[PDB]
Ligand binder design. Structure first.
Ligand SMILES: Nc1ncnc2c1ncn2[C@@H]1O[C@H](COP(=O)(O)CP(=O)(O)OP(=O)(O)O)[C@@H](O)[C@H]1O
Ligand SMILES: [Zn+2]
Ligand SMILES: [Zn+2]
Lengths: 51, 61, 113, 45, 66, 48
RNA sequence: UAUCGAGAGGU
């Protein structure tokens, strides 16, 4: 596509049935600087959903 | 500040014509929560129209 | 969530130049041109045109990362010619070839009506 | 005060929070909030 | 859900051909020939109409909620 | 101290005690009943 | 911005 030149190799090409799986990156991405701690250990809490 | 949480229209920039809400207006640089995609953008307060009693009024509301 | 605005591919920020020329002093008479908000479309077009000039000794370009709409070109000309000038000529040369091409299409189009 | 809609008979009505939660028309106790006064915009992309 | 407006792969409009495609099938044409008559030449475009499932007909059976 | 055995609030206004707090309560109750026997109604097989 | 568990999953 960049040059319009043919590819030296031919490409296996055609329809195939593909699935959209439940795993999406913006449901997983997570970062923590500081945030909440456990009352008993004062160590950071567990889980994306709790910071 | 008197324009937080009030509905806004953008009149300049790449987001021109889009609806939003003033999420945070600390000073000069506001944070408008766009309606159309799920993102809150930085925008100068000069770029906004606020809704009031009669139509969309610039930052004289 | 971290997706940039699609208009950033072609709208130039006001503090960002469409074009920036610096020298490559490692060899004589060579410039590096950084093009902002441009594609293979412009770069490959200029590149071939330039490479066929007899007084162009080196021309290449690369898009360093497909997620950012810029590219960088390297252009060296022989002692006689000044590199930036050869680039100006390639622009006007290609504009002319496209003017001709637009004319011949217009004519051929009426002929096919 | 606030517009609702009956989940069974689709009657539209209002309630002043203190009213019991049912439809005046059929007495159904499952109701749904009517849409916002606010304008909605989408980017058509 | 409802016929897509464009072919995903090339962009050709196919959202104006759904009724014509169903009509050709009532008239007894085979699916391949019906697609041929509709001028759907690239197989990306043929896939769009041949494999679409009209679910909006199912969703409409649910008595409107206003 | 309570730092070792903190209380938790299930629904804002409802708080339960740590397992250790309850277990020390059990030791304290059981301790009082040893004092209540050897000084009055002790049927021996009950003191044990 | 709870605690204890359980179940289903990701590499
Ligand atoms: N149950 C588990 N416990 C621990 N580590 C695990 C694991 N399941 C997966 N992993 C990690 O993930 C790797 C598995 O990689 P996969 O993607 O599952 C297979 P592969 O051998 O890399 O490729 P293949 O699919 O070509 O055979 C393990 O080697 C380990 O690094
Ligand atoms: Zn009702
Ligand atoms: Zn197609």
């Amino acid at each position: 596509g960049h040059t319009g030149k043919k590819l030296m190799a031919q490409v296996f090409f055609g329809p195939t049935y593909y699935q959209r799986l439940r795993h999406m990156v913006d449901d997983k991405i997570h970062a923590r600087a500081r945030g909440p701690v456990q009352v008993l250990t004062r160590q950071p809490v567990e889980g994306r959903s709790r910071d | 500040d008197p324009t937080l949480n009030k509905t806004v229209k953008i009149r300049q920039g790449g987001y021109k014509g889009k609806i939003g809400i003033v999420k945070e207006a600390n000073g000069d640089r506001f944070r408008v929560e766009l309606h159309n995609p799920n993102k809150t953008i930085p925008i100068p307060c000069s770029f906004l129209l606020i809704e009031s009693t009669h139509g969309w009024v610039p930052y004289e509301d | 969530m971290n997706a940039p605005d699609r208009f950033e591919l072609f709208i130039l920020p006001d503090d960002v130049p469409k074009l920036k020329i610096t020298p490559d002093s490692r060899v004589p008479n060579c410039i590096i041109i950084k093009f902002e908000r441009e594609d293979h479309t412009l770069a490959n077009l200029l590149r071939e045109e330039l490479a066929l000039y007899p007084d162009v000794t080196f021309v290449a370009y690369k898009v360093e990362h497909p997620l950012f709409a810029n590219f960088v070109m390297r252009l060296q000309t022989e002692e006689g010619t000044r590199p930036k000038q050869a680039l100006e000529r390639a622009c006007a040369s290609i504009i002319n070839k496209l003017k001709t091409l637009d004319h011949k299409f217009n004519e051929e189009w009426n002929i096919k009506n | 005060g606030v517009k609702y809609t009956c989940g069974a008979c689709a009657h539209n009505f209002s309630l002043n929070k203190s009213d019991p939660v049912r439809c005046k028309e059929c007495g159904h106790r499952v109701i749904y909030k009517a849409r916002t006064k606010r304008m909605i915009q989408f980017d058509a992309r | 859900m409802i016929i897509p407006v464009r072919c995903f792969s090339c962009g050709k409009v196919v959202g104006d051909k759904w009724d014509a495609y169903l009509r050709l099938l009532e008239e007894g044409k085979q699916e391949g020939d019906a697609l041929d008559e509709l001028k759907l030449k690239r197989y990306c475009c043929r896939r769009m109409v041949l494999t679409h499932v009209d679910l909006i007909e199912k969703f409409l059976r649910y008595n409107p909620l206003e | 101290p309570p730092q070792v055995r903190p209380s938790i609030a299930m629904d804002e206004t409802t708080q339960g005690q740590d397992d250790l707090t309850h277990k020390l309560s059990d030791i304290l109750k059981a301790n009082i009943n040893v004092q209540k026997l050897e000084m009055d109604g002790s049927p021996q097989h009950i003191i044990n």
